[PDB]
Ligand SMILES: CC(=O)N[C@H]1[C@H]([C@H](O)[C@H](O)CO)O[C@@](OC[C@H]2O[C@@H](O)[C@H](O)[C@@H](O)[C@H]2O)(C(=O)O)C[C@@H]1O
Ligand SMILES: [Cl-]
């Protein structure tokens with residue numbers, strides 16, 4: 001067991017999408033008759049005129065290796081936040097099935113099971129103060145060593161990079177969506193909020209007695225062990 005998110009919500013979305021592609025194929029939709037290694041869920045734009053961010057089931061063979069403007073794909077952390085992950089949508093040639101309602105409902109279900117109350121609290125602090133941001137302890141602009149608690153705009157995070165987050169005991173944990181400390185415009189898009197985030201984390205009630213030891217887990221609740 002690593003002290004890290006299992007990315008269980010994302011895993012549930014991809015499985016549900018593999019099921020939907022298999023049903024579509026059975027319905028005659030030939031382009032969806034693929035092995036399950038070819039299907040993932042992404043939160044993204046679709047083809048031309050599909051311009052909002054929706055949960056869709058994509059054939060990875062139709063995804064671009066990288067994105068230009070508004071066409072990147074997003075994956076989801078175990079608190080239900082969407083974060084850039086590798087790939088881009090081909091606006092003419094994408095092979096996908098938009099399934100926003102079922103996939104959103106699985107995200108809400110997963111958030112109840114997996115999202116650390118301590119992380120929920122830190123994310124809420126960030127969102128209230130800077131709409132759209134989530135909390136990580138990670139890199140800032142042009143410095144690839146130093147970490148601090150910051151409210152990060154989700155578009156500036158990288159799902160493939162794990163960064164420190166709060167476990168469900170309020171202890172060190174690592175979650176997808178991190179910074180590299182590089183020097184691009186995206187690397188500027190955060191608000192360092194060391195005191196406010198730490199207080200938000202500290203205000204959460206322990207799931208354990210003041211005499212028990214909280215051992216965190218990648219799904220709620222953590223272990224409470226007698227001292
Ligand atoms: C421009 C942007 O999106 N984020 C800035 C961020 C914000 O301007 C700030 O948090 C707004 O409240 O500031 C960052 O620098 C913090 C740093 O800023 C200096 O001006 C000051 O000298 C320092 O005391 C300190 O506040 C941040 O990390 O928060 C940079 C970020 O790019
Ligand atoms: Cl997570």
Ligand SMILES: [Cl-]
Nearest residue numbers: 099100101102
């Ligand atoms: Cl749906």
